[PDB]
Amino acid sequence: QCTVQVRLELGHRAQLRKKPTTEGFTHDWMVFVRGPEQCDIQHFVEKVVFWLHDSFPKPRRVCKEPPYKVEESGYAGFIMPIEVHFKNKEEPRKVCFTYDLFLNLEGNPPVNHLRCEKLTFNNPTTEFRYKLLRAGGVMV
Ligand SMILES: O=C(NC1CCCC1)c1cn(-c2cccc(O)c2)cn1
């Protein structure tokens, strides 16, 4: 008879290189999933899958432990599905976000963006509830 809320932060950075790569990639970028200060999402997160554009090599990028991030070089923004899988035996087993990985046009400052996500678990099992609480989760 309980609800537990946990917080995730998804974000990215992007900057124009001083000089493009030999391939002609103009930008360095980094996407991540993290917890707020002090929290450890690794208690309830099995893994984070970042689905890169098909143009990237091995575009299914998996992080089973922190940091949950991908560092890349490229020349264009794209919509990146990001799946956060839970150490959970029942539904929901994962959440999927549609992440807008946008780059800065020439002249514009570097990108430093954050998206705060609140997950509400209705009546988690006892076992999963231990994992959510150990991560810094809160009973509503
Ligand atoms: O920016 C790239 N591709 C855009 C086209 C439409 C949105 C995404 C990109 C980067 N790469 C690459 C290749 C080789 C090593 C590497 O690190 C990156 C391939 N493609």
Q: What is the number of structural domains in the chain?
A: 1
Which residue owns the Cα nearest ligand 1 atom 1? Answer: 74
**75 within ligand 1 shell (Cβ under 6 A):** yes
At 19, which CATH number?
Answer: 2.60.40.1970
d(CA 137, CA 6): 5
Are 113 and 12 in contact, with CB atoms under 8 Å apart? yes
Which residue owns the Cα nearest ligand 1 atom 4? Answer: 76
Give me the resolution in angstroms, 1 decimal.
1.7
Quote the domain boundaries for residue 2. 1-140
Technique used to solve these coordinates: X-ray
**53 within ligand 1 shell (Cβ under 6 A):** yes
State the number of CA atoms in the 13 A half-sphere of 121 facing the CB: 28
d(CA 38, CA 54): 35
